[PDB]
Design a protein around this nucleic acid. Structure first.
Ligand code: MG
Ligand code: MG
Ligand code: MG
Lengths: 117, 252, 88, 106, 65, 52
RNA sequence: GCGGCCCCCUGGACGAAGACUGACGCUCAGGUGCGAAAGCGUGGGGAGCAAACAGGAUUAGAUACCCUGGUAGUCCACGCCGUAAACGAUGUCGACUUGGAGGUUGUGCCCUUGAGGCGUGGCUUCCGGAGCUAACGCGUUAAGUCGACCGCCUGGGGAGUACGGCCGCAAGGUUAAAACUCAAAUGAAUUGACGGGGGCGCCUUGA
């Protein structure tokens, strides 16, 4: 059993799913949760509620590893950003850096074709 | 989906079929009573598959027809025509009309039974029929017409205007007949080699066969077979295609 | 597309004086020198069609000027094409 | 001849040989009978993002009027000399002698 | 407009990071000319300058780098 | 520094960055003719307001 | 058609102010060359994307629409093809003929400077007068007023199809009929339907 505290939190949100993972300052994963592992499937898997629940599951995993400090970064286009990070405010940490780190290309390679719908 | 409407061409099709006893006849897709009746009439008794169980009830309860046919109610692509050929004493005459998404499957299932089928007689859309009979050097030619002409001799019976159909389509369509060769004029070591040679070639039909079949064979193999590798895939007869198939199979 | 000094050498050769520019002789000479130079460009830059559109304009402009001078005075024409070696 | 700006940056841990670099390149300029109108250093200076995983690298400017040939020599000398981590050469309109804003801030 | 036109009339610029900072987002993107009030001539010069300044890590490309 | 005020500050920053609108529209390729048509369509759809 | 940045070579354009040549001009059948996208030829490359294909779904069926894959292709050098709603659906060149609000890029003079304010080329956008136009509209960047030459059309289908020639590696390109068949075919614009509405019996289009 290991106790450390310096914490980086990554929110990886998409219109199918939201993964959340906690890492050390090194970026080394301490533990993680998703929505789909929270148990929701199809439509429920991508909901602000499922993203809160995923954050609660990570909050439990870090209670075992580290809880004093966190630096939270957010990625992917999906819903529930606010919902999952306010769920990190549950068992609240002292955090101040927020931006997205959503990948924007400087005119990178050809995206998929549009859906015929 | 479609079925025919006008007695002139119904009568032309059922008469051109020449359906009589001394033939192991089976309908598929009996559809509207009007075109299944004359064939169930002229044959003293007739076998049939309908895919639909509700239409199979409509026709099996019809006293013209239920007493005069034996009737089956399933996807014909499940159906064991090789056993029906045994039960009918001689290889089958298989015939009719359908919604024809299933058409491409029908041909392969019929070809899975080239021994058990004596002949096939079916309506189809103008472009696919003209493809099916297409001569090697034409844009209408290609892989499915190659496999068809490999398995059988193929013969247009007659051609029908779109106003002839109950829901009339925009599209003219023809009845065609075909004959599994009594011995294959093109003997082949395997058909999967044909199927993959033809798909590779026709997946690349604009480039030279050196840049199609020569992606697998050498130019010296091709010219060794007597084939110019600078041709395009749509210059090539089924004869040299089965020669390639034999070459692939026997040199592997 | 030429240095002022190569232009100066050419106009001081083919021109009436330093006040002359654009006498037919001056024109066809500097135009010829440019055409000669650009052979080195296109000998590398084969695919530079947009540049060679200017070259085609220049050789045809040269032809037009020569033919005008030829009908205006054969002596000036012949001694000028002699000096430039034109109709090569 | 063509005026140029030549502007380049040197590894913080090779910044001590920068005078030797100014010798090597200024000798190439005057050895081409070219002339120089600015030479400047802005010291070790922090980078907006990491260059070659480094920080704080040492910045240098020249204003010059050399014949084209030797600019390609010193340019390719930058790809030979790994102490130079980047360079940019600019075919500027004029010789310019007034100090860089990077100096004039002092 | 005319005050922003004076900013163009006075100067054409590269290496003046202090003035370049007047025309960038904090995320490092170029400001559109209508928001700067400057005329398009100077917008082009500023864009060219910013691109050079990014090449030499004088300005970032993004917020992060 | 209240968490939900730092959240509002963050929300303003990502709105000013436009990143959700960018990644939304960047989801697919497009045949350049249609954004050309859409662009000029918007240009006249705008210009019609200029008239009073 | 051309869009990160720098270099190297290189084409054209516009303004300034003179100077110079001395009608050297325009147009252009044949001819010659450039010519998107797709495809081909020869040899590389292959990240992402993706005809074909393959497999899972959906549907009365679904070949579609959905998804997981995926080859050619997409990229490069060097050949070819030579077509596109390659359309401003508007040939090239020259002269003339109300205005108005912008944009962009030179330039002159005045600047009290710095802003300004008088001018003055070039390019370009939108309004619109006269005139023109079947009407729609065009309108000093004409579809107005006219001069020179070139290209092209002569009812609708049959048919840009046949055949022949040419051209192309092949695709195909190109030039190009006729029989035969019909009393139309067609452009613009008007009024009802629209209709599914949409708002509030009434104005009127998520259709
Ligand atoms: Mg290729
Ligand atoms: Mg291509
Ligand atoms: Mg033709």
């Amino acid at each position: 059993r290991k106790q450390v505290s310096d914490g980086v939190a990554h929110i990886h949100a998409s219109f199918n799913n939201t993964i959340v993972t906690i890492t050390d300052r090194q970026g080394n994963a301490l533990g993680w949760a998703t929505a789909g592992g929270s148990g929701f499937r199809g439509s429920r898997k991508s909901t602000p509620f499922a993203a809160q629940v995923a954050a609660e599951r990570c909050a439990d995993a870090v209670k075992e590893y580290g809880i004093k400090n966190l630096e939270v970064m957010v990625k992917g286009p999906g819903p529930g950003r606010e919902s999952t990070i306010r769920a990190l405010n549950a068992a609240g940490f002292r955090i101040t850096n927020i931006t997205d780190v959503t990948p924007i290309p400087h005119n990178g390679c050809r995206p998929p074709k549009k859906r015929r719908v | 989906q479609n079925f025919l409407n006008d007695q002139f061409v119904i009568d032309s099709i059922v008469s051109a079929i020449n359906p009589q006893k001394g033939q192991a006849m089976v309908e598929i897709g009996p559809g509207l009573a009007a075109l299944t009746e004359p064939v169930g009439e002229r044959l003293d008794q007739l076998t049939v598959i309908e895919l639909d169980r509700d239409l199979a009830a409509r026709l099996q309860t019809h006293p013209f027809l239920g007493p005069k046919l034996t009737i089956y109610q399933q996807d014909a692509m499940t159906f064991n025509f090789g056993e029906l050929a045994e039960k009918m004493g001689q290889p089958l005459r298989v015939f009719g009309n359908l919604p024809y998404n299933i058409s491409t499957p029908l041909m392969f299932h019929l070809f899975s039974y080239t021994d058990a089928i004596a002949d096939m007689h079916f309506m189809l859309q103008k472009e696919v029929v003209n493809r099916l009979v297409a001569g090697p050097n034409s844009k209408a030619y290609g892989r499915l017409s190659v496999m068809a002409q490999y398995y059988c001799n193929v013969i247009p019976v007659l051609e029908v205007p779109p106003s002839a159909f109950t829901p009339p389509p925009k599209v003219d369509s023809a009845v065609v007949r075909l004959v599994p060769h009594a011995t294959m004029p093109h003997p082949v070591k395997d058909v999967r080699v044909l199927s993959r040679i033809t798909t590779e070639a026709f997946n690349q039909r604009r480039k030279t066969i050196r840049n199609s079949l020569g992606n697998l064979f050498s130019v010296e193999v091709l010219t060794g077979m007597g084939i110019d590798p600078a041709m395009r895939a749509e210059n090539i007869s089924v004869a040299q295609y089965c020669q390639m198939a034999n070459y692939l199979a026997e040199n592997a | 597309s030429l240095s002022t000094e190569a232009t100066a050498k050419i106009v001081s050769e083919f021109g009436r004086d330093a006040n002359d520019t654009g006498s037919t002789e001056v024109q066809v000479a500097l135009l010829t020198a440019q055409i000669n130079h650009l052979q080195g460009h296109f000998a590398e830059h084969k695919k530079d069609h947009h540049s060679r559109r200017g070259l085609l304009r220049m050789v045809s402009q040269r032809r037009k000027l020569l033919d005008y001078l030829k009908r205006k005075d054969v002596a000036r024409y012949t001694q000028l094409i002699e000096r430039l070696g034109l109709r090569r | 001849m063509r005026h140029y700006e030549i502007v380049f940056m040197v590894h913080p841990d090779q910044s001590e040989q920068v005078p030797g670099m100014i010798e090597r390149y200024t000798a190439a300029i005057t050895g081409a009978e070219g002339k120089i109108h600015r030479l400047e250093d802005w010291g070790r200076r922090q980078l907006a993002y990491p260059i070659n995983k480094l920080h704080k690298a040492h910045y240098v400017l020249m204003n010059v009027e050399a014949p084209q040939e030797v600019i390609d020599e010193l340019e390719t000398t930058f790809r030979f000399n790994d102490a130079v981590i980047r360079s940019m050469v600019m075919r500027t309109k004029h010789a310019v002698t007034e100090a860089s804003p990077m100096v004039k801030a002092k | 407009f005319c005050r922003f036109t004076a900013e163009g009339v006075q100067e054409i610029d590269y290496k003046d990071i202090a003035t370049l900072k007047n025309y960038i987002t904090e995320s490092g993107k170029i400001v559109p000319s209508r928001i700067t009030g400057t005329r398009a001539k100077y917008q082009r010069q500023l864009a060219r300058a910013i691109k050079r300044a990014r090449y030499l890590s004088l300005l970032p490309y993004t917020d992060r780098h | 520094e209240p968490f939900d005020v730092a959240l509002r500050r963050f929300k303003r920053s990502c709105e000013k960055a436009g990143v959700l609108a960018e990644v939304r529209r960047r989801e697919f390729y497009e045949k350049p003719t249609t954004e050309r048509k859409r662009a000029k369509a918007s240009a006249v759809k705008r210009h019609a307001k200029k008239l009073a």
